Amino acid sequence: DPSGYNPAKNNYHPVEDACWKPGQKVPYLAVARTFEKIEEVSARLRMVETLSNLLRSVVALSPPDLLPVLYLSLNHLGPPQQGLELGVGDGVLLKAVAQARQLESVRAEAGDVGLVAEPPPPLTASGVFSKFRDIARLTGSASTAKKIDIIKGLFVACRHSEARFIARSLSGRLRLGLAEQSVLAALSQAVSLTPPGQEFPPAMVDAGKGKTAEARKTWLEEQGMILKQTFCEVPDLDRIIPVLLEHGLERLPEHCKLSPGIPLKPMLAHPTRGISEVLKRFEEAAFTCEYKYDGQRAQIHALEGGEVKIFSRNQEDNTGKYPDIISRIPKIKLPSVTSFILDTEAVAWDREKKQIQPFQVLTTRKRKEVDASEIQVQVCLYAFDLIYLNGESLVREPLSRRRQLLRENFVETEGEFVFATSLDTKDIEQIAEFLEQSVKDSCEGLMVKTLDVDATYEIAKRSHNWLKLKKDYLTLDLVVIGAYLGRGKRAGRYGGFLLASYDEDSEELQAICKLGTGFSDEELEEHHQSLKALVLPSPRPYVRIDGAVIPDHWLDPSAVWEVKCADLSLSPIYPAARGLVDSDKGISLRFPRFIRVREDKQPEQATTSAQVACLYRKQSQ
Template sequence: MSKRALSSSTSPSKNKRLKIQLASQPKIENFFYSSTKARVSVNPATNARHSSPSRQKASTSSTAIPDIIDVDSLESEDENKLKHYKELKNESPVVPVVGTLAGSNARLSEAEFSSLDVDPSLYDPVLQPSNSPHAPYALLTHALVALSQTRSRISIINILTNLLRTITLKHPSSLLPAVYLLSNTLGPQFVPIELGLGSSIISHSIQQVSGLSPAALKRMYNNTGDPGDVAFAAKTNIRTLIPHAPLTVPYVYQSLLRISRCKGHGAGKEKQKIVEKLLLAASGEEVRYLTRTLYQNLRVGAVRTSILAALARAFVLTPPSTIPNHPSASTDSAFSSPGKISVDSASRATLGSPSKRKQTYNALSVRFKEAESLIKQVYVKHPSYDQIIPALLEKGFESLAERVPLVVGVPLLPMLGSPTRSLDEIYDRLNDLPFSAEFKYDGQRAQVHALRTFNGGPTVKIFSRHLEDMTTKYPDVIGLVNSMFRTSENLTSFIMDAEIVAIDPTTGLIRPFQDLAGRARKDVNIRDVKVTVCVYAFDLMYLNEKPLLELTFNERRSLLRNNFIVRKVPQEDLSVSFFDFVESCESIQGRIFIEEFLSKAVENRCEGLMIKLLDTPATAVVGDPEEKQKRMKALPATYEPDVRTSGWLKLKKDYIDSMSDSLDVIPVGAWYGNGRKAQWWSPILLALWNPETGRPVALCKCMSGFSDAFYAQMRAKYSPDSEHCSKQPIWECDFGGFSPDIYFQPCEVWEIRGADITESPVSMAAHGMVSSSRGLSLRFPRFIKTRGDKSIELASSPSFLVEIWKSQQGKGKGPAQMDDGELIDVELEDSDFDRSDSSESD
């Protein structure tokens, strides 16, 4: 990749335009916080920004070569800049041509790109004007602008498909960084790459590039609540005298990686230098979305499922054989093989009779579904674009699953259980099929990977439920795996699903989850381990170079118990953790025994039971193959990564009929408190996660169950000046009739209980699913605990809320009192139960 250098300046002349060197701004604590130190001033008479003579003298003596900023076009006052920005908000966003360079480095404006929001079968990527080796960042920005203007999932997938087709055909080397930038990540989930870029660095960089004062930028931020909009407005009239080369997708991605690698003394300055280079080279809408990328909030609806679907469709329409200079490239642009459409043939699909067009579209639809299913199956077993995209570029879908297989060291997405509310529901779902009931431990779910190396010792990796690498958090578990390989010569590799639980080393009794939560998150020294843990294994997905996902749970459990030995003896050595299998019982022991087993689980500080189907049913509905296939798919005994099926059912003590409802919700906003709670947020607006739209949907207000300490912690995290708060709804969420005083960034999950579920005219949760004009809400919600183990995508869904509502109606409770969304801030007894984290188990 070619290096980019900032433009240099020569000695200023009296006959030339006034040039300034931007002085270093003081460090700020929050976004656009005003500083009291000296800063660049404005001389209304000359309409130019300048610093004091002493500061100018210091600038000329500096060895650093500054960027030259043409300030002739700047407004004379910051207020005029704000006025101009307000006018821009009502105009269509256009990327202005800052300057042109010779050859393929010429900057492209957004107007030059053809629309991406069209049917992929009608789209021709050849018509896009980008022809440089690397994809221009302007093309990616063009797609982000289109994505931000629609909420239709069909349109989102079409835009992504057409973008990825263009990059695949014209800039294949840019495909991997483009996908990471679209997904707002720097790498796979299990690779610990953090941007580590504070809002102060971004705001300081915008000040340096724009020349505006912190106060002016602060006013812009108060008007919009979005740093991307502020950066766009601040840089609108800024021009460099010597134009920068246009940004490319690989350059932006590599710059972000360089930022993530900045460590130690002087890291902040180095990060700011990289950010300033990016902002100086960016133009128009590039500035807006580059800033949002730096701020890690793109505000577009490109969720993982949409990106995978678009990637599959892109390679259906543009297979590797159509890529220029590809080894398999063919001169024939017609159907290269059944279901594969090249660039030209996609356009020809619109010709001919209507029946021919219909046949073509039907065939294309089938091919899309097959390709999407294949890529998703590969991704859930090997969730890394680092291997998937190069494999697609090499041979397309041909033997993709074999070329990107399940391997030790790369975590697969865990299988999930479906919630149930009673044993009656469990027996009804499983149709009296044999099942196993297991303790649902209150610990941290862990995926343990181990591979024997040439020297005999294993390489060990431990991943969390969210695929985060937490190997260094558990040196005692690493010691356990080492002992397993020493005592078993036949053991060469395995991937195990387990729950890590704190226990008493002398009695073996389970200790509270808080004891485990007190352990440091990484780089734990074995000498600092104070709490003994036990690894309770409950599944085995890989053993001795053989994947086991297609085996039934009964078969996998047998292999687990036959190849590993329980290690649970009272001891004083904490360098090696305990090992045991989850405590379980079988359905053949009778329903009464299962009920007693549930009580035993609660007594042993477990969350409830996990019900697992032992074997896939051999027969379903006699004489109807389609119904049989659907039934077997709904009741799999195989291991299904990233799928919530009826093969695994969870019966939590909070879900039992005699208990209150329990939901996992997302705090998305709040109102100012009254009386004693005036210094805090109360009530809090809670939301469910809608997987169909890829964003939260408002459910209800909550003001019960919070301790004073929790209120204080929440106010500190969601302070009005923090990056997690905004006076404007800048984060995607369906708020319905709720209008909170402050909006929260959806970033955590809480567990709540309520009295019952009711219809609501203001709630958008499950809107249209039970009523054409109303959603569902929760009456008398009460905060239980923070679910630190769950991401917002794992919060309860509207469909789950509907299931509880239907169950409630079936019990004869009838329709509950209407919830109009109002909540009086009454004084309730504050709960002293303040728990910052909870089980990582499903």
């Protein structure tokens, strides 16, 4: 019966076309039949609709199962502030699949571990979700063998395509072409066509029957926006879905409101090609340029009562990471400030030298540090936006209003709390001077944001309303030494390449980084046909990769390619220019990207390791 569930049929009847009786639990084969339908198409509009159909039947037949199927669709375990980690990777999964042959026999890997995984009672969407959370809670000695027993049990109770999606979910890559934005769209459409909370049989099955083409289309877009904006204020399905089922989507904003202590999605940013693009994109609109600091974003929450909370860009609870900010919280606020959401950037600060350390020094800090004195790498917050002030939300306020509120209610404590360096002007000469000074002041670039025109703190309108003017968006010449196999959208062809530089004194090619972005499918096919006969079974003696990942296809060094990167970093695993700067660490590329092939050059004529050292030395650090 559930083998024939087709949530992609025309005139889908949520009750008759369902595959489970009302009041019963949604079987996992139902959501697995839906997944197979979503991955068989490419248009998101047909993806959002096929999902949405399953969400109708769930809202009508088994309401309490809605939250589990949404998370199973999102491939998540709950709200990000919780932090439940699966702790299961490819190795753990392969072991569980064999216990249902041999680990070497299961080492086929197509690309996709689900295909390799392909009497008990049938599986349940809630039961599978509770088993996923059980796996996540398993910690301590022999916790792995406990996880593998649970996973082993799932694969035995799997049927049809259940084995390929359970394995995909646990591996962390469902690869459905459907993510959070379409899941919300499918949910908003679902509850608008089938309202929740109807006595069975539901008096309304399809609330878009008596509407025109423009009517339903415009209606569903307005309904989706009410849900999308509220999610951006409360990204917590455990907090939205109970309210959604109780009071409809129309009343959802009246209860799920932007509150301190509950994280909210921050304003993203889109890269600007140059000053010409930011001037054209912000035509006749005022624009302020700030210094994009190179650190980790800190969302400082000040709940009414004194409890301080700190979240990350992805709503991860970072309170235990910054006890110093939890202590210095009152030093940055004014007496009238009773509750506030500060949008700051946490960068490493050397209190002795009064300078900002690079990003790597920030990452050497402890994640769960109960000892405040044991914190060596100090931090200084750079506040650049305010989203809340004394019981009031500032989402619908322009940037000029939020800026004047931050500057008039927060004290600049030099060395620990300083406002971001800003410059409000339109002269192309002043913009270049501020851009050159930002790199001179140890910053990655310049942020460009409006002050009044489309300058509110609203994600659903445009999550990428801010502009990023980084210097690398305005290069090295390295040889290939090997190729890697592709996974997912890269199966059957090449996925990443390992590049190397030429050490003149050592007379050996030294691996400097891997390269897996910046090329089209036609260029990747041109790379395959060109670097095909160069396949070598063993590495050449002049090649040296040190601790880098051994390429699946050793290549005869003969291809010189141009690679651009953001920064040069000291590498713990690469041998490029080891000893030239650090005694035991080489040099690698931050954010590498492929540019073009240099057919005019040979491996001998490429970026030397001595050059890589000089480039790293002339890097403001």
